[PDB]
Design a protein around this ligand. Structure first.
Ligand SMILES: Cc1cc2nc3c(=O)[nH]c(=O)nc-3n(C[C@H](O)[C@H](O)[C@H](O)COP(=O)(O)OP(=O)(O)OC[C@H]3O[C@@H](n4cnc5c(N)ncnc54)[C@H](O)[C@@H]3O)c2cc1C
Length: 381
Protein backbone atom coordinates (compact mmCIF):
# COMPACT_ATOMS: atom_id res chain seq x y z
CA UNK A 1 0.00 0.00 0.00
CA UNK A 2 1.03 3.59 -0.71
CA UNK A 3 2.26 5.66 2.22
CA UNK A 4 -0.03 8.61 2.93
CA UNK A 5 0.94 11.46 5.23
CA UNK A 6 -1.67 13.95 6.41
CA UNK A 7 -0.43 17.23 7.88
CA UNK A 8 -2.80 18.24 10.65
CA UNK A 9 -4.94 16.13 12.98
CA UNK A 10 -7.92 18.46 13.11
CA UNK A 11 -11.47 17.68 12.00
CA UNK A 12 -10.42 17.36 8.37
CA UNK A 13 -7.26 15.35 8.90
CA UNK A 14 -8.82 12.80 11.23
CA UNK A 15 -11.98 12.40 9.18
CA UNK A 16 -9.82 12.03 6.07
CA UNK A 17 -7.77 9.27 7.70
CA UNK A 18 -11.02 7.44 8.48
CA UNK A 19 -12.28 7.84 4.90
CA UNK A 20 -9.01 6.47 3.50
CA UNK A 21 -9.17 3.51 5.88
CA UNK A 22 -12.79 2.91 4.85
CA UNK A 23 -11.68 2.79 1.21
CA UNK A 24 -8.88 0.41 2.18
CA UNK A 25 -6.35 2.91 0.88
CA UNK A 26 -2.71 2.91 1.99
CA UNK A 27 -0.92 3.15 5.30
CA UNK A 28 -1.91 6.45 6.89
CA UNK A 29 0.12 8.60 9.29
CA UNK A 30 -0.85 12.01 10.65
CA UNK A 31 1.50 14.77 11.85
CA UNK A 32 0.01 17.23 14.35
CA UNK A 33 1.89 20.37 15.43
CA UNK A 34 0.15 20.56 18.82
CA UNK A 35 1.86 18.68 21.66
CA UNK A 36 -1.44 17.01 22.51
CA UNK A 37 -4.84 16.80 20.80
CA UNK A 38 -7.35 18.54 23.09
CA UNK A 39 -11.14 19.00 22.88
CA UNK A 40 -10.77 22.70 22.06
CA UNK A 41 -13.25 25.06 20.43
CA UNK A 42 -16.97 25.61 20.94
CA UNK A 43 -20.08 24.59 19.01
CA UNK A 44 -20.21 23.90 15.28
CA UNK A 45 -22.87 22.54 12.92
CA UNK A 46 -22.45 19.38 10.84
CA UNK A 47 -24.88 19.39 7.88
CA UNK A 48 -26.96 16.25 7.14
CA UNK A 49 -24.76 15.29 4.16
CA UNK A 50 -21.66 15.42 6.36
CA UNK A 51 -23.52 13.59 9.14
CA UNK A 52 -24.39 10.87 6.60
CA UNK A 53 -20.69 10.49 5.75
CA UNK A 54 -19.79 10.15 9.43
CA UNK A 55 -22.61 7.64 9.95
CA UNK A 56 -21.35 5.50 7.06
CA UNK A 57 -17.98 5.70 8.83
CA UNK A 58 -19.66 4.06 11.85
CA UNK A 59 -19.87 7.16 14.05
CA UNK A 60 -23.66 7.44 14.19
CA UNK A 61 -23.96 6.20 17.82
CA UNK A 62 -21.07 8.38 19.01
CA UNK A 63 -22.64 11.49 17.50
CA UNK A 64 -26.09 10.74 18.94
CA UNK A 65 -24.47 10.35 22.36
CA UNK A 66 -23.03 13.88 22.40
CA UNK A 67 -24.58 16.16 19.78
CA UNK A 68 -28.01 17.77 19.44
CA UNK A 69 -30.20 16.91 16.42
CA UNK A 70 -31.28 20.50 15.74
CA UNK A 71 -34.75 20.45 14.18
CA UNK A 72 -35.60 24.13 13.74
CA UNK A 73 -34.13 27.59 13.13
CA UNK A 74 -36.09 30.63 14.33
CA UNK A 75 -35.26 34.17 13.25
CA UNK A 76 -36.58 36.54 15.91
CA UNK A 77 -36.95 40.32 15.79
CA UNK A 78 -35.87 42.86 18.38
CA UNK A 79 -39.11 42.41 20.32
CA UNK A 80 -38.34 38.69 20.58
CA UNK A 81 -41.11 37.56 18.22
CA UNK A 82 -40.51 34.86 15.63
CA UNK A 83 -40.28 36.47 12.19
CA UNK A 84 -39.29 33.38 10.22
CA UNK A 85 -38.76 29.73 11.03
CA UNK A 86 -37.76 26.63 9.12
CA UNK A 87 -37.16 22.98 9.93
CA UNK A 88 -33.67 21.48 10.02
CA UNK A 89 -32.40 17.91 9.91
CA UNK A 90 -34.74 14.97 9.37
CA UNK A 91 -37.88 17.07 9.80
CA UNK A 92 -36.67 19.27 6.94
CA UNK A 93 -36.67 16.23 4.67
CA UNK A 94 -33.09 15.09 5.18
CA UNK A 95 -32.27 11.40 5.54
CA UNK A 96 -29.95 12.22 8.45
CA UNK A 97 -30.06 14.84 11.21
CA UNK A 98 -28.10 18.07 11.32
CA UNK A 99 -25.90 17.81 14.41
CA UNK A 100 -24.95 20.78 16.57
CA UNK A 101 -21.88 19.58 18.42
CA UNK A 102 -18.96 20.82 20.51
CA UNK A 103 -16.03 20.86 18.06
CA UNK A 104 -13.82 19.36 20.77
CA UNK A 105 -16.17 16.45 21.37
CA UNK A 106 -16.20 15.84 17.62
CA UNK A 107 -12.40 15.83 17.48
CA UNK A 108 -12.23 13.30 20.33
CA UNK A 109 -14.75 11.03 18.59
CA UNK A 110 -12.72 11.15 15.38
CA UNK A 111 -9.43 10.72 17.25
CA UNK A 112 -10.79 7.70 19.13
CA UNK A 113 -11.90 6.06 15.87
CA UNK A 114 -8.53 6.74 14.21
CA UNK A 115 -6.54 5.23 17.08
CA UNK A 116 -8.92 2.25 17.15
CA UNK A 117 -8.84 1.47 13.43
CA UNK A 118 -5.41 2.76 12.43
CA UNK A 119 -3.47 2.13 15.60
CA UNK A 120 -2.12 4.30 18.38
CA UNK A 121 1.06 5.02 16.38
CA UNK A 122 -0.85 6.57 13.50
CA UNK A 123 -1.09 10.08 15.02
CA UNK A 124 2.20 11.80 15.71
CA UNK A 125 1.67 14.87 17.89
CA UNK A 126 4.18 17.59 18.66
CA UNK A 127 5.46 17.53 15.07
CA UNK A 128 4.89 20.48 12.77
CA UNK A 129 5.47 20.36 9.02
CA UNK A 130 8.05 22.98 8.08
CA UNK A 131 9.54 21.99 4.72
CA UNK A 132 8.25 20.01 1.74
CA UNK A 133 9.90 18.65 -1.41
CA UNK A 134 8.65 16.32 -4.10
CA UNK A 135 11.69 14.26 -5.00
CA UNK A 136 12.57 10.70 -6.03
CA UNK A 137 8.99 9.75 -6.82
CA UNK A 138 7.84 10.66 -3.31
CA UNK A 139 7.10 13.66 -1.12
CA UNK A 140 9.81 14.38 1.43
CA UNK A 141 8.66 16.22 4.53
CA UNK A 142 10.77 18.12 7.04
CA UNK A 143 9.10 18.50 10.43
CA UNK A 144 10.24 19.82 13.80
CA UNK A 145 9.23 18.86 17.34
CA UNK A 146 8.68 20.96 20.45
CA UNK A 147 12.37 20.73 21.33
CA UNK A 148 13.33 22.09 17.92
CA UNK A 149 14.63 18.70 16.77
CA UNK A 150 14.24 17.89 13.03
CA UNK A 151 12.16 14.95 11.78
CA UNK A 152 12.35 13.67 8.22
CA UNK A 153 9.46 11.72 6.71
CA UNK A 154 8.50 10.44 3.27
CA UNK A 155 5.23 9.49 1.62
CA UNK A 156 3.63 8.67 -1.72
CA UNK A 157 0.91 11.21 -0.97
CA UNK A 158 0.89 14.34 1.19
CA UNK A 159 -2.49 15.68 2.27
CA UNK A 160 -2.41 19.22 3.57
CA UNK A 161 -5.14 19.30 6.20
CA UNK A 162 -3.25 21.83 8.30
CA UNK A 163 -5.96 24.49 8.63
CA UNK A 164 -6.05 28.27 8.62
CA UNK A 165 -2.25 28.70 8.77
CA UNK A 166 -1.47 25.73 6.52
CA UNK A 167 2.22 25.17 5.84
CA UNK A 168 1.37 22.87 2.95
CA UNK A 169 -0.78 25.56 1.29
CA UNK A 170 1.97 28.18 1.71
CA UNK A 171 4.42 25.77 0.06
CA UNK A 172 2.13 25.23 -2.94
CA UNK A 173 1.04 28.87 -3.27
CA UNK A 174 4.01 30.94 -1.97
CA UNK A 175 2.78 34.14 -3.63
CA UNK A 176 -0.70 33.89 -2.16
CA UNK A 177 -2.64 36.71 -0.53
CA UNK A 178 -2.47 36.99 3.26
CA UNK A 179 -5.76 36.05 4.98
CA UNK A 180 -8.69 38.19 3.78
CA UNK A 181 -10.69 39.97 6.48
CA UNK A 182 -14.42 39.55 5.97
CA UNK A 183 -15.16 42.81 7.75
CA UNK A 184 -16.84 41.11 10.70
CA UNK A 185 -15.56 40.56 14.25
CA UNK A 186 -16.70 37.41 16.04
CA UNK A 187 -17.11 36.50 19.71
CA UNK A 188 -18.37 33.05 20.64
CA UNK A 189 -18.72 30.82 23.66
CA UNK A 190 -21.06 28.56 25.57
CA UNK A 191 -23.42 29.27 28.46
CA UNK A 192 -25.34 26.76 30.54
CA UNK A 193 -29.12 27.06 30.50
CA UNK A 194 -31.64 25.43 32.82
CA UNK A 195 -33.85 25.40 29.73
CA UNK A 196 -33.68 26.77 26.18
CA UNK A 197 -36.82 26.25 24.13
CA UNK A 198 -37.07 22.52 23.40
CA UNK A 199 -33.32 21.99 23.69
CA UNK A 200 -32.92 21.51 19.95
CA UNK A 201 -33.85 24.81 18.33
CA UNK A 202 -31.47 27.38 16.85
CA UNK A 203 -32.15 31.08 17.36
CA UNK A 204 -30.97 33.89 15.04
CA UNK A 205 -31.31 37.66 15.48
CA UNK A 206 -29.86 40.97 14.31
CA UNK A 207 -30.47 44.67 14.87
CA UNK A 208 -30.59 47.66 12.54
CA UNK A 209 -26.86 48.19 13.21
CA UNK A 210 -26.13 44.75 11.72
CA UNK A 211 -24.98 43.23 15.01
CA UNK A 212 -25.92 39.53 14.81
CA UNK A 213 -26.61 36.75 17.30
CA UNK A 214 -26.83 33.00 16.67
CA UNK A 215 -27.52 30.62 19.56
CA UNK A 216 -28.10 26.87 19.68
CA UNK A 217 -27.79 23.87 22.08
CA UNK A 218 -24.87 21.50 21.48
CA UNK A 219 -24.75 19.03 24.38
CA UNK A 220 -26.70 15.77 24.46
CA UNK A 221 -25.31 15.11 27.96
CA UNK A 222 -26.82 18.35 29.25
CA UNK A 223 -30.09 17.55 27.48
CA UNK A 224 -30.15 14.19 29.27
CA UNK A 225 -31.05 16.24 32.35
CA UNK A 226 -33.46 18.64 30.72
CA UNK A 227 -30.73 21.27 30.70
CA UNK A 228 -28.88 22.80 27.75
CA UNK A 229 -25.39 23.98 26.82
CA UNK A 230 -26.12 26.93 24.57
CA UNK A 231 -23.47 27.79 22.00
CA UNK A 232 -23.59 31.41 20.94
CA UNK A 233 -21.95 33.64 18.36
CA UNK A 234 -22.06 37.42 18.20
CA UNK A 235 -21.05 39.06 14.92
CA UNK A 236 -20.34 42.79 14.68
CA UNK A 237 -18.92 44.90 11.82
CA UNK A 238 -15.16 45.11 12.37
CA UNK A 239 -15.35 48.80 11.46
CA UNK A 240 -17.02 49.31 14.85
CA UNK A 241 -14.39 47.36 16.78
CA UNK A 242 -10.96 48.29 15.50
CA UNK A 243 -8.20 45.67 15.51
CA UNK A 244 -8.69 42.76 17.90
CA UNK A 245 -5.31 41.09 17.39
CA UNK A 246 -2.31 40.80 15.09
CA UNK A 247 -3.29 37.36 13.78
CA UNK A 248 -6.39 35.14 13.60
CA UNK A 249 -6.42 32.45 16.33
CA UNK A 250 -9.09 29.76 16.87
CA UNK A 251 -8.39 29.66 20.63
CA UNK A 252 -8.01 33.34 21.55
CA UNK A 253 -9.85 34.49 24.67
CA UNK A 254 -12.20 37.43 24.31
CA UNK A 255 -13.59 40.02 26.72
CA UNK A 256 -17.21 40.53 27.77
CA UNK A 257 -16.59 44.28 27.83
CA UNK A 258 -15.68 44.26 24.13
CA UNK A 259 -18.83 42.50 22.92
CA UNK A 260 -21.56 43.39 25.45
CA UNK A 261 -21.76 47.10 24.46
CA UNK A 262 -23.09 46.12 21.03
CA UNK A 263 -25.97 44.17 22.56
CA UNK A 264 -26.45 46.29 25.70
CA UNK A 265 -29.57 47.95 24.28
CA UNK A 266 -31.13 44.65 23.20
CA UNK A 267 -34.21 43.36 25.01
CA UNK A 268 -35.70 40.30 23.36
CA UNK A 269 -38.06 39.81 26.29
CA UNK A 270 -38.34 36.05 26.80
CA UNK A 271 -34.67 35.63 25.83
CA UNK A 272 -32.15 37.54 27.98
CA UNK A 273 -29.05 38.33 25.90
CA UNK A 274 -27.30 40.07 28.80
CA UNK A 275 -27.71 36.82 30.76
CA UNK A 276 -26.45 34.74 27.83
CA UNK A 277 -23.23 36.74 27.58
CA UNK A 278 -22.63 37.53 31.25
CA UNK A 279 -22.91 33.90 32.42
CA UNK A 280 -20.64 32.49 29.69
CA UNK A 281 -18.35 29.56 30.53
CA UNK A 282 -15.88 31.18 28.11
CA UNK A 283 -15.63 33.85 25.40
CA UNK A 284 -13.38 33.50 22.35
CA UNK A 285 -12.59 36.26 19.82
CA UNK A 286 -11.88 35.78 16.12
CA UNK A 287 -11.79 38.02 13.03
CA UNK A 288 -14.08 36.60 10.33
CA UNK A 289 -11.43 35.66 7.76
CA UNK A 290 -11.26 33.53 4.61
CA UNK A 291 -8.92 33.15 1.64
CA UNK A 292 -9.29 34.08 -2.03
CA UNK A 293 -10.44 31.21 -4.30
CA UNK A 294 -7.50 29.38 -5.92
CA UNK A 295 -7.25 28.33 -9.60
CA UNK A 296 -5.86 24.96 -8.49
CA UNK A 297 -5.19 23.19 -5.19
CA UNK A 298 -2.49 20.57 -5.57
CA UNK A 299 0.67 19.81 -7.50
CA UNK A 300 2.07 16.36 -8.17
CA UNK A 301 1.62 14.11 -5.14
CA UNK A 302 0.49 16.93 -2.83
CA UNK A 303 -3.08 18.12 -2.23
CA UNK A 304 -5.09 20.22 0.24
CA UNK A 305 -8.22 19.53 2.29
CA UNK A 306 -10.48 21.45 4.67
CA UNK A 307 -9.45 24.95 5.71
CA UNK A 308 -6.00 24.51 4.15
CA UNK A 309 -7.79 24.23 0.82
CA UNK A 310 -10.75 26.56 1.26
CA UNK A 311 -10.88 28.51 4.53
CA UNK A 312 -14.38 30.03 4.94
CA UNK A 313 -16.25 32.26 7.39
CA UNK A 314 -17.41 30.08 10.31
CA UNK A 315 -21.15 30.05 9.58
CA UNK A 316 -23.81 27.83 8.03
CA UNK A 317 -22.42 24.64 6.51
CA UNK A 318 -18.92 26.06 6.06
CA UNK A 319 -15.94 24.46 7.76
CA UNK A 320 -16.26 21.03 9.34
CA UNK A 321 -19.02 19.84 6.99
CA UNK A 322 -16.96 20.73 3.92
CA UNK A 323 -13.75 19.20 5.30
CA UNK A 324 -15.59 15.96 6.04
CA UNK A 325 -17.00 15.75 2.50
CA UNK A 326 -13.55 16.58 1.04
CA UNK A 327 -12.19 13.50 2.81
CA UNK A 328 -14.82 11.19 1.35
CA UNK A 329 -14.15 12.48 -2.17
CA UNK A 330 -10.37 12.24 -1.79
CA UNK A 331 -10.61 8.62 -0.66
CA UNK A 332 -12.97 7.83 -3.54
CA UNK A 333 -10.63 9.48 -6.06
CA UNK A 334 -7.63 7.51 -4.80
CA UNK A 335 -9.69 4.30 -4.94
CA UNK A 336 -10.82 5.01 -8.52
CA UNK A 337 -7.48 6.00 -10.07
CA UNK A 338 -4.25 4.02 -10.42
CA UNK A 339 -2.03 7.10 -10.71
CA UNK A 340 -1.64 9.15 -7.51
CA UNK A 341 -1.27 12.52 -9.24
CA UNK A 342 -4.34 11.95 -11.43
CA UNK A 343 -6.35 10.86 -8.38
CA UNK A 344 -5.47 14.06 -6.55
CA UNK A 345 -6.38 16.23 -9.53
CA UNK A 346 -9.75 14.48 -9.91
CA UNK A 347 -10.49 14.97 -6.21
CA UNK A 348 -9.57 18.66 -6.45
CA UNK A 349 -11.64 19.42 -9.53
CA UNK A 350 -14.61 17.73 -7.90
CA UNK A 351 -14.37 19.84 -4.73
CA UNK A 352 -12.63 23.12 -5.66
CA UNK A 353 -15.33 24.58 -7.96
CA UNK A 354 -17.88 23.96 -5.21
CA UNK A 355 -15.74 25.56 -2.51
CA UNK A 356 -14.95 28.60 -4.67
CA UNK A 357 -18.64 29.20 -5.38
CA UNK A 358 -19.43 29.19 -1.65
CA UNK A 359 -16.56 31.58 -0.87
CA UNK A 360 -17.55 34.10 -3.55
CA UNK A 361 -21.25 33.92 -2.64
CA UNK A 362 -20.58 34.31 1.09
CA UNK A 363 -18.49 37.40 0.39
CA UNK A 364 -21.18 38.94 -1.80
CA UNK A 365 -23.92 38.41 0.79
CA UNK A 366 -21.80 39.95 3.57
CA UNK A 367 -20.90 42.89 1.32
CA UNK A 368 -24.55 43.49 0.40
CA UNK A 369 -25.66 43.43 4.04
CA UNK A 370 -22.94 45.89 5.05
CA UNK A 371 -23.89 48.25 2.22
CA UNK A 372 -27.59 48.09 3.10
CA UNK A 373 -26.98 48.60 6.81
CA UNK A 374 -24.75 51.60 6.08
CA UNK A 375 -27.44 53.88 4.68
CA UNK A 376 -29.69 56.04 6.92
CA UNK A 377 -35.18 46.21 14.27
CA UNK A 378 -34.18 49.01 16.63
CA UNK A 379 -32.85 47.67 19.96
CA UNK A 380 -35.75 48.38 22.33
CA UNK A 381 -33.53 50.06 24.94
C1 LIG B 1 -8.04 24.62 18.63
C2 LIG B 1 -9.06 24.86 17.55
C3 LIG B 1 -10.31 25.34 17.92
C4 LIG B 1 -11.28 25.56 16.95
N1 LIG B 1 -12.52 26.05 17.33
C5 LIG B 1 -13.50 26.29 16.39
C6 LIG B 1 -14.75 26.78 16.76
O1 LIG B 1 -15.01 27.01 17.94
N2 LIG B 1 -15.71 27.01 15.80
C7 LIG B 1 -15.44 26.76 14.47
O2 LIG B 1 -16.29 26.97 13.61
N3 LIG B 1 -14.21 26.27 14.09
C8 LIG B 1 -13.23 26.04 15.04
N4 LIG B 1 -12.00 25.54 14.64
C9 LIG B 1 -11.74 25.31 13.17
C10 LIG B 1 -12.52 24.11 12.63
O3 LIG B 1 -12.07 22.92 13.25
C11 LIG B 1 -12.34 24.03 11.12
O4 LIG B 1 -12.71 25.26 10.52
C12 LIG B 1 -13.11 22.89 10.40
O5 LIG B 1 -13.58 21.90 11.32
C13 LIG B 1 -12.24 22.17 9.32
O6 LIG B 1 -11.20 21.48 9.99
P1 LIG B 1 -9.69 21.48 9.44
O7 LIG B 1 -9.04 20.16 9.75
O8 LIG B 1 -9.59 21.87 7.97
O9 LIG B 1 -8.99 22.66 10.32
P2 LIG B 1 -8.56 22.57 11.87
O10 LIG B 1 -9.65 21.94 12.69
O11 LIG B 1 -8.18 23.99 12.24
O12 LIG B 1 -7.27 21.60 11.95
C14 LIG B 1 -5.99 21.97 11.47
C15 LIG B 1 -4.99 21.12 12.28
O13 LIG B 1 -3.74 21.24 11.63
C16 LIG B 1 -2.71 21.56 12.59
N5 LIG B 1 -1.58 22.28 11.94
C17 LIG B 1 -1.51 23.58 11.52
N6 LIG B 1 -0.28 23.78 10.99
C18 LIG B 1 0.42 22.62 11.06
C19 LIG B 1 1.71 22.26 10.66
N7 LIG B 1 2.49 23.13 10.03
N8 LIG B 1 2.15 20.98 10.87
C20 LIG B 1 1.33 20.04 11.47
N9 LIG B 1 0.04 20.39 11.85
C21 LIG B 1 -0.39 21.66 11.65
C22 LIG B 1 -3.43 22.24 13.82
O14 LIG B 1 -2.76 22.23 14.96
C23 LIG B 1 -4.86 21.65 13.71
O15 LIG B 1 -4.94 20.59 14.63
C24 LIG B 1 -11.01 25.31 15.59
C25 LIG B 1 -9.75 24.82 15.22
C26 LIG B 1 -8.78 24.59 16.20
C27 LIG B 1 -7.44 24.07 15.77
Amino acid sequence: PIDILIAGAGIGGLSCALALHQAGIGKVTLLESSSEIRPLGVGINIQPAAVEALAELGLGPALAATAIPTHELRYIDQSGATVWSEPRGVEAGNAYPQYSIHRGELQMILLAAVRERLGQQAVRTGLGVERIEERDGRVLIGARDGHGKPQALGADVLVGADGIHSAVRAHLHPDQRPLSHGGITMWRGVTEFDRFLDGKTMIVANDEHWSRLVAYPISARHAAEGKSLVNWVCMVPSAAVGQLDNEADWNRDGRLEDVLPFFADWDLGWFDIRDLLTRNQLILQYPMVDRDPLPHWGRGRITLLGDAAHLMYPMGANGASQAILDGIELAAALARNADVAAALREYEEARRPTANKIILANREREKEEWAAASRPERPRL
